[PDB]
Amino acid sequence: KGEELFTGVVPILVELDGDVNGHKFSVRGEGEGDATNGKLTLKFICTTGKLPVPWPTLVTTLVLCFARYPDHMKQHDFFKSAMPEGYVQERTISFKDDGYYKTRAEVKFEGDTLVNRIELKGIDFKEDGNILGHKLEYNFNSHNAYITADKQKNGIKSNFKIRHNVEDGSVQLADHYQQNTPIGDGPVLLPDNHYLSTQNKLSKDPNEKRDHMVLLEFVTAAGITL
Numbered sequence: 004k005g006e007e008l009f010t011g012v013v014p015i016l017v018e019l020d021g022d023v024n025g026h027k028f029s030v031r032g033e034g035e036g037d038a039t040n041g042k043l044t045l046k047f048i049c050t051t052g053k054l055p056v057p058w059p060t061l062v063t064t065l066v067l068c069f070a071r072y073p074d075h076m077k078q079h080d081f082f083k084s085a086m087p088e089g090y091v092q093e094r095t096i097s098f099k100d101d102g103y104y105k106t107r108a109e110v111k112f113e114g115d116t117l118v119n120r121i122e123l124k125g126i127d128f129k130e131d132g133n134i135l136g137h138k139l140e141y142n143f144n145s146h147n148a149y150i151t152a153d154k155q156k157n158g159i160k161s162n163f164k165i166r167h168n169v170e171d172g173s174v175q176l177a178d179h180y181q182q183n184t185p186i187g188d189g190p191v192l193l194p195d196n197h198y199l200s201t202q203n204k205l206s207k208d209p210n211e212k213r214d215h216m217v218l219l220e221f222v223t224a225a226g227i228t229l
Contacts, residue, residue: 005086006077009038009068014116015045017065023125024102024135026055032065034218036117038083041071043220048213056125057139058216059167062203063179064094064106066119070199070222075229079194081150081159081183087112088187090158099176102128111186133167133175140168143203148179149226152193158184159194197226 017032034045047058047065054061068082082090089111096104108121128135148163160182167175185191204219 004084005068006080006083008086008112009083011039012037013069015043015066015119016113016116017045017047017119017121019061019065019121019123021056021123021125023056023104023123024128027051028055030054030061030065032119032218036066036069038069038071041069041222043069043218043222045218045220046208046211047216047218048211049215050213053214056128056134057137057141057167059139059141059143059205060096060098060104060134060177061123061216062143062205062218063096063165063177064104064108064121064123065218066110066117067092067199067222068110068117070224072224076197076224076227078192079197079227080224081152081192081194082110084190084192085183085185085187088185088189090183090185092181092183094179094181096180097178098128098134099178100129101132101134101175102126109186133169138169138171139175140170141205142168143205144168145200145202147198147200147225149196149198150194151196153182154193156182156184157191157193158182195227197224199223200225 019030032047072080165177
């Protein structure tokens with residue numbers, strides 16, 4: 004089974020190419036994940052100069068196969084079951100009173116490395132808004148994302164709202180609609196309703212001159228009990 008690929012720490016590569024209001028940019032992330040504790044450690048660099056949107060707005064776009072599913076929940080782990088062939092993850096992310104992202108990603112093994120490759124399009128972002136104006140706190144709140152089976156597409160869906168703190172004390176909501184489908188034609192696990200619970204730390208590498216984000220995340224599945 005795909006879960007067998009996640010017994011220990013696995014290297015991760017993330018490649019995002021973006022187009023937000025016509026601003027073209029790229030991000031490359033490298034690090035590793037361990038589904039045994041749900042821990043991700045990654046460093047992301049903007050390889051095209053300054054990132055023209057705020058780093059925190061890309062966290063959800065930038066590998067749910069690394070979530071820690073408790074033993075009694077293993078039968079509900081769609082994400083690992085799709086491996087190694089992987090899955091497509093698509094989202095629309097709507098920023099309240101501002102623009103929206105559309106993302107298409109493939110998450111799959113390329114050799115021994117788990118790769119998340121994303122094409123992101125942003126439109127209708129506002130001049131001097133929180134996104135293009137970089138007015139968001141460099142942080143990311145703990146958060147629960149509810150997962151549901153989507154039998155008609157042999158995959159899963161999720162809808163959740165991220166609260167991005169704005170530096171004037173307001174909040175910038177980002178409403179995510181997500182759908183995942185397997186890349187391969189083998190059997191996958193279609194889950195009962197549950198959620199993924201996240202804890203994140205965003206920091207900086209003091210020796211890195213490029214625009215970048217160091218990310219530490221824990222992701223734990225919950226909501227189904229004994």
